[PDB]
């Protein structure tokens, strides 16, 4: 969630997805991470998430799920043809939950 | 024809303030002689000194009554940097001590670093709260958590005005649509400081008073300020005593739902400015309905001001002491 200017080799789930799971053609870690996020969003949504380390909010997780998982799911190789759809279901469940409980407030339209 | 009545106050020095009780049957006076006196109105309409005591180690600047729901409570503030709270013990002191003894000092508030220039109880619907302002440029708000134990007062809020504070006024509005508000005046003589009246609003989200407004048109030293009682108006009225009498209306602008923690913005209008004292104005006080303003000044007069049905304010009476 914190990008320091100078490390070109990221450690974490985004590299494991792109280097390990993509070579195995199986995505169990990415689905289990989407399931963790889906359960955490349903039980507690923290407004001050990342306060003091970065700008507060959920945006880095949303960018990973949107740009790295969802927008790329079709371009990936899959050993099991069914797992293509298991990955799509797992990310779309998170997006549905995030939009279900969201109501537009006047504060959302002001840059804090 | 207003009849002036002299009361032999028997103060040994200048009287700085006079405060009536909620029923207008008692008055408290405070002086440079370091004393507070209480006076009771008899059935014949005469005033009698029923208590007199030394309260402070310096000039007593203001005296205020609490609302009678909290019992018979007085607060005084002083040049000695303190505010003191006093309770009247209504009981059978055996018929030999009718002179001085039924007022008990319950606490002394000592957090102020310089002269405590004004002291005001909050509106009763906020509980037993006491605001003090000091020339150190801080307003302090205390609360008595137990009305049966007036010895304990907790400092709830500290408001930095960044100007020497001279006077305070609670907004008396019981409307739940209005957050609690305090106006603070400054006697700072510096001509470079514009905005000597500051309005603070209690922000529930932050649990702090935040500066809502500054009356930039008030550049002259402020000697007294008073919010008018709000009997069903959708706007507030503030009187300001300075080189002239000023009356401001403050209409809350509807919170656009987009500022998730802002202070209320006000549409502020000067509805009256009266130079008829031709001198500094020292005190301003509203009638119980918030429709008539009284002012006093160096001209040795008390003036009465009232709006007509077209919101045009006029002087409706002048009282002069003989």
From TrEMBL, chain A:
Signal peptide per UniProt: none
Location within or outside the cell: Nucleus
Family: Belongs to the NUP186/NUP192/NUP205 family.
Official protein name in the record: MGC83295 protein
Organism field: Xenopus laevis (African clawed frog)
Residues of the full protein shown: 672 to 783 of 2011
